[PDB]
């Protein structure tokens, strides 16, 4: 059911857990961020333990692993958001109806590089200069190049137009962004609070 | 895993099952339909057996049953649509990103009718090139609801000082609900497709 690295929730279903600086889990997530954002200052990293979001995501993951006949469907990506959206994402995940640029489709956008999500247009500095970025488990699955105005990914072969790609990208050979068009294709795993 | 009265699907993920008149299952849907739509005639009623949509929907239902306090969270509602949308809905369900602007808008989501007569309007159940009209009968997790408003992209909060604790859906009128709007994927399961004609 619930992942091993999660800590006890006293029979509750939602908790934001601040990570201890210098332990393995904190160090792994900090490393992913500082690869492109070494010039920023990390205030804290919180593990998001949202049982409902996790359950709905794990269901979609098992479905995509069955449909794709292989289990290489997940990537870790970044998502910058404004402070006022943070409670929403913690509790409800990412909502294409809320989503800035949509040149590759009307979905939720995720960056390969923290540096892209660190842009003020995405991770808007709050009145205290705090910026907020998620590390997100994303079911990118089998992907294709996106285009403006997509409401879902294109068909995997427009002879069978309901069999869809899982996500779209800017560039299939060297992707820097992914767009997903369904709820529960993305699990917000950590929230990084940082400053310029 | 799947309802024990579904047809054996032979490790296939999706089947449409044609129902037989005189069976309770057909006759109950026909009665629900003809209660407001006696001037149309049913061609056929198909049960939709979509394993993945059922799984995702049932998880959302379990979640809402846990969250809410012994509420009847699920209603059986109608959805009229055009022929062009039927294969998508059968396979992928109801997508708010594809939704029509309703003549009376209570938010930017997917609309479901209490009365078949509403879904039977040509604006929704557009007759195809053969004069067939299509209406789903849908399990909808309405949960705890409030009157909607045209600007909504999710249900409103129950409490403006806790913006993330949302109503489950919105309606046109809480005293006499005739439509519901839902704003999330897997909150509605297309259970039957009614094909009907003038
Ligand atoms: O981290 C993000 N948070 N919120 C976003 O909307 C977002 C958007 C985003 O790509 C937008 C885009 C569109 C077209 C061309 C581009 F080069 C880039 C990348 C990251 C983010």
Joined together, the tokens standing for residue A185 give: 């294709």
Q: Is the Cβ of A85 closer than 8 Å to some Cβ of chain B? A: no
Taking the alpha carbons at both ends of chain B, their separation in whole angstroms is 39
CA distance linking residue A74 with residue A137, whole number of Å: 6
Instruction: Transcribe B66-98 into DSSP letters.
Output: HHSSS---EEEEEEEE-GGGHHHHHHH---GGG
CA distance linking residue B191 with residue B45, whole number of Å: 10
Domain B1-198 has CATH 3.30.930.10: no
Question: Is the separation of the CB atoms in B81 and B136 below 8 Å?
Answer: yes
CA distance linking residue B150 with residue B117, whole number of Å: 23
Which sign, positive or negative, has the C-alpha torsion A173, A176, A182, A187? positive
Chain length of chain A:
196
A53 SS3 class: helix
Whether A96 and B97 lie within 8 Å, measured CB to CB: yes
- The CATH topology of domain A1-196 is Phosphoenolpyruvate Carboxykinase; domain 3 (3.90.228)
Residue of B nearest to A87 (CA): B164
Joined together, the tokens standing for residue B12 give: 């296939």
List Cβ neighbours of B8 (8 Å cut-off, separation of 6 or more): none
This PDB structure is determined at a resolution in Å of: 1.8
List Cβ neighbours of B171 (8 Å cut-off, separation of 6 or more): B106, B142, B145, B146, B147, B148, B177, B178, B179, B180, B181
Residue B196 distance to chain A (closest CA, Å): 24
Nearest Cα residue to B75 out of B186, B183, B180, B192:
B180
Q: How many CB atoms lie within 10 A of CB A13?
A: 16
CA distance linking residue B88 with residue B145, whole number of Å: 27
Domain locations along chain A = 1-196
> Does A117 sit in the ligand 1 pocket, CB within 6 Å?
yes
C-alpha torsion B8→B51→B29→B138, nearest 10: 180
- Cα B105 off chain centre by: 17
C-alpha distances out from residue A10 to A20, A57, B155, Å: 20, 22, 29
* Interface probe with B: pick from A182, A186, A187, most Cβ of B within 10 Å: A182
Nearest Cα residue to A96 out of A32, A181, A172, A21:
A181
């Amino acid at each position: 059911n619930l992942p091993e690295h999660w800590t006890d929730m006293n029979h509750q279903l939602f908790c934001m857990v601040q990570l201890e600086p210098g332990q393995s889990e904190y160090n792994t997530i900090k490393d992913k961020f500082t690869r492109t954002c070494s010039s920023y200052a990390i205030e804290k990293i919180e593990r998001i333990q949202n049982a409902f979001l996790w359950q709905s995501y794990q269901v979609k993951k098992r479905q995509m692993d069955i449909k794709n006949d292989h289990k290489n469907n997940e990537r870790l990506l970044f998502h910058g958001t404004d402070a006022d959206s943070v409670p929403y994402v913690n509790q409800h995940g990412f909502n294409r109806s809320c989503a800035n640029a949509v040149s590759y489709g009307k979905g939720t956008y995720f960056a390969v590089d923290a540096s892209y999500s660190a842009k003020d247009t995405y991770s808007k500095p709050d009145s205290n200069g705090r910026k907020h970025m998620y590390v997100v488990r994303v079911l990118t699955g089998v992907f294709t190049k996106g285009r403006a105005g997509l409401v879902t990914p294109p068909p995997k072969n427009p002879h069978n137009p309901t069999d869809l790609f899982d996500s779209v990208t800017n560039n299939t050979r060297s992707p820097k962004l992914f767009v997903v068009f369904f709820d529960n294709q993305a699990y917000p795993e950590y929230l990084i609070t940082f400053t310029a």
